[PDB]
Design a protein around this ligand. Sequence first.
Ligand SMILES: *Cc1cc2c(cc1C)nc1c(=O)[nH]c(=O)nc-1n2C[C@H](O)[C@H](O)[C@H](O)COP(=O)(O)OP(=O)(O)OC[C@H]1O[C@@H](n2cnc3c(N)ncnc32)[C@H](O)[C@@H]1O
Length: 514
Amino acid sequence: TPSTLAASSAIIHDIIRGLADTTAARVRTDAEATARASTDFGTNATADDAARPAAVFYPSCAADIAALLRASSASASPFPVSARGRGHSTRGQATAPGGVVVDMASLAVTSASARLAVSVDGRYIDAGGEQLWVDVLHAALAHGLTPRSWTDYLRLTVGGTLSNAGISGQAFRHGPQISNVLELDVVTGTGDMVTCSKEKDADLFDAVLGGLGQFGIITRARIPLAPAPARARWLRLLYTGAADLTADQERLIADDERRGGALAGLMDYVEGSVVTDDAARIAALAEEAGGVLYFLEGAVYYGGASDTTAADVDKRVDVMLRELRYARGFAYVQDVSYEQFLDRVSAGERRLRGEGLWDVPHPWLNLFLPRSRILDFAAGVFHGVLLPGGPVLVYPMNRGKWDGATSAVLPYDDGDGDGDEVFYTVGILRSAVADGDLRRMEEQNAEVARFCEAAGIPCTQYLPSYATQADWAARHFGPAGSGRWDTFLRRKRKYDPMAILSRGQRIFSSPLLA
Ligand SMILES: *Cc1cc2c(cc1C)nc1c(=O)[nH]c(=O)nc-1n2C[C@H](O)[C@H](O)[C@H](O)COP(=O)(O)OP(=O)(O)OC[C@H]1O[C@@H](n2cnc3c(N)ncnc32)[C@H](O)[C@@H]1O
């Protein structure tokens, strides 16, 4: 009987004003709050008028979020509700156009002891979903402990990265952040608060991990901790080609116990990058190579509560500088604290902000591709599409460190069994600075995607963005397993049947049919 027409701001405001009256949660409907909640890292505009929510909700308790989700799901025309972490998304993933954005930071009333509780005996930290990874790090280090898996950039929320995967140079060893969670407190789209883990409501736990915010809002994540090292020996090695870079990265990320190899188990972190556009020396070698150079980045942790000593580090660096195929005379080694290494990108952000180059559009593209096609991709993209800004990252990870039961999508089919253990990530992290940059960079991104589809390179987007369910099903979830899309829909029907959660992800726009 009720109309399917989208609930108006009038109906939404009446429901949420009721919530502001019956809970300690606060509501803002003013243009300043809604303009901020309409944008993300993808744009630098004051407001994205199309993405503007009807209101911003400032929860005091996870129960306020539960009341909001229940109120929307049970109403005549359910309204969109989206959690916002730091809005580091670039394609509107945290927007709730004509709906309600949940300011997750409000739960911390962002660093707060109550939201970052360390259990020394249990070797875990109970972190609020809104908490930043930098604050999780400092809270753990105060007890000589550390999370095992990171993102390169630490000013991201626990709930935000866990809804994607959370990748960095440690993922080859300990898996992404989603592989390093003991339990979660989740507020489902239906408005229930469920504590879940591999032992209880595993279906919700696995759905939420890499789940693009489709099943519920993470209000707490219990993160396991390892003994913390004190320092890190940090290497940056130049390479003249993709072949030796990738071959060496694979040697470094090899599983020491199972596969082995001379360079296995030496590095605690392995990344790489492409430079398309001591400065005069690098520029001279660039012309000789053909305009494109590569970097291998590594780190060996030592000291503190680690088993690796400063003497062990010298021995490992000696092995790596002898065995690696980097360009001789282009090896850069630095010694930093463990915290300085993990928080390294902060110096980059500070520098960019100071030059007015941070608050600019970010037409980013992140991909996962099989090891078998990395050289074909390098030839067509790094030596083609992207041939002359921002960094271009390239590095391998180990599939075995990822749990296939979660929502996360890798470039493998579940039914193909144990194929290639190694896959690559490519991060095209450019900033639109000059006039015409945005249109040019967005077209180059679309061109990378069209080039892969045409060359038959299986390509999976990390932080995916598709407009149709046909693309989500056949291009994204489908090549990952015959039951992946059916599993995603089954979980959606169970946890968010009205499809109100994170509609900015563009998977669902309307309640699921019978
Ligand atoms: C901006 C940026 C992003 C980034 C990065 C560096 C920068 C400068 N480096 C990364 C890295 O090294 N490794 C990696 O895995 N990701 C990296 N990113 C991307 C980043 O992970 C994503 O942008 C991610 O979304 C985390 O950002 P944030 O915490 O800001 O989250 P969001 O953009 O607001 O929301 C993302 C989606 O998740 C939903 N959401 C938000 N909070 C929750 C909670 N608590 N529970 C459930 N869902 C939640 C949003 O609705 C949205 O769909």
